[PDB]
Each structure stands twice: as structure tokens, then as C-alpha cells.
Amino acid sequence: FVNQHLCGSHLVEALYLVCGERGFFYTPKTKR
């Protein structure tokens, strides 16, 4: 963890761990 490869569910869960209950504005390579 902390510095690693991350994809799909693992990247979504890492974003929820980093951002907390506020979540993320990102969408998985959809326009962003």
C-alpha cells in the first residue's frame, strides 16, 4: 500500500481510503 500499482476496485477503495467519506470526483478514464 501507500506507493504501488492500483486498478479498478483496488483504485476505487484507495481513493475512498485517501479522500474519506467525502469521496472522489473522478470517473475511470471516462473524459477525465
Binding site: 501507500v2 506507493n3 504501488q4 492500483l6 483504485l11 484507495a14 473522478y26 471516462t30 473524459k31
Partner: peptide, 21 residues
């Protein structure tokens, strides 16, 4: 989008913070 970094190369919490609400 950060999937095109994290999924094939390395990324980190400081780079995930850039996408937080």
C-alpha cells in the same frame, strides 16, 4: 485519467489526493 497511470505504472496517496472531492 489516473487509471492510465496506477493500473500499468506506480502511483501513490499524494497523487490520489489530486482527485478527492
Amino acid at each position: 485519467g489516473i487509471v492510465e497511470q496506477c493500473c500499468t505504472s506506480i502511483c501513490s496517496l499524494y497523487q490520489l489526493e489530486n482527485y478527492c472531492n
